[PDB]
Amino acid sequence: MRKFIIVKNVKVDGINAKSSDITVGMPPATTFCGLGETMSIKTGIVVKAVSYGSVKFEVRGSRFNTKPLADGVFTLCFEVEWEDCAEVLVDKVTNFINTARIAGGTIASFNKPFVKVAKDAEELASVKNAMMPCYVVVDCGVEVNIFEDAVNRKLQPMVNGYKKLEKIVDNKHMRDKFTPAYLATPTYTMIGYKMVSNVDNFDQALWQYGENTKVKTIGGIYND
């Protein structure tokens, strides 16, 4: 919990809004975890976690009559390990965003990346508020299942990982014949959205990969 780089107003065109057979809209936390992981690989920077928020978002055809495509604007925040400089980080990140994709859609513009630092829990709230304004995604857990929870808790299902179903036997068509490959199906959690400044503990908005082919937050299930 020391160093974070923030990228406000990442405008993205032609997002593939479909993240599973039953979820269409906001790209799940897996997607933004994959974005940070991809950045780490290409830039050699160590990315610990990512908070992301919604600024604007619209599935095409859902506001006015005119596969499911969307467009929106996000604010991103990467928890990072880096001491080599401050703007050499800001430049490596700029360079990567310019050509990165978010759920298949192209970045059209973003504010300039900047670096924020936290020495304790209290500075961590300043990192959080530097994302304003945006609605970040926090993990509310599953009580019963995503269907019952969607009706009764009025919360929003979100892909949070995958269950491996079977190992792939013949890698004929597989891109990569050394990495272990699995037939898999998405798993879900329930999420809620918070105006960042209203998040009590920023750890609970910082998403990263975890055990058993899931993503989760550093601080666990969201609690007010």
Binding site: A17, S54, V151, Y182
Partner: protein
């Protein structure tokens, strides 16, 4: 009763599955049957060419019958007994097919797995019924199988009204 239904189903190249890549591409032939997934209310999907299956006078084909009165669990467990079992499970068999499906890397410790995502029959069939019964409308509807769903799966062939999807649009800074 049920036998001639299953009989005619095994006659054609009939497969019972809990997961399939067809839901994402009508030409993919990946079908998987996750045995741990099976419970009293587990909805299942099936495939025959042209989605055949004889139509028992009650008007129903096997897919309709198997998903009505928890008939799949009943049969698959044994309150039916050997005869109207094991050959029900003779079709609950896998079929690997990667073509047209995505391949993604998913971090795993130091290293990665590569995952080929396929969709879940129960969440489609039971999910749509559940959001229907409970008057939940914060949804999109998606019709699968293309024009000609009868050649995709049995559930696509009968649920021509479409499957419900959660509208995951977020709030917006105004």
């Amino acid at each position: 009763m049920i036998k001639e239904m299953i009989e005619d189903f095994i006659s054609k190249g009939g497969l019972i599955f809990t997961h399939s890549g067809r839901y994402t591409n009508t030409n993919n032939s990946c079908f998987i049957f996750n045995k741990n997934d099976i419970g009293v209310d587990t909805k299942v999907d099936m495939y025959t060419p042209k989605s055949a299956g004889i139509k028992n006078e009650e008007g129903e084909n096997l897919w309709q019958v198997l998903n009505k009165a928890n008939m799949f669990y009943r049969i698959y467990s044994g309150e039916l007994g050997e005869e109207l079992q094991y050959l029900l499970k003779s079709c609950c068999t896998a079929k690997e097919d990667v073509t047209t499906l995505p391949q993604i890397y998913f971090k795993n410790g130091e290293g990665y797995d590569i995952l080929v995502p396929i969709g879940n029959a129960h969440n489609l069939i039971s999910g749509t019924e559940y959001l229907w019964e409970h008057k939940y409308y914060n949804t999109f509807t998606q019709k699968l199988g293309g024009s000609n769903p009868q050649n995709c799966t049995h559930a696509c062939n009968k649920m021509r009204g479409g499957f419900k999807q959660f509208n995951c649009t977020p709030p917006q800074v105004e």
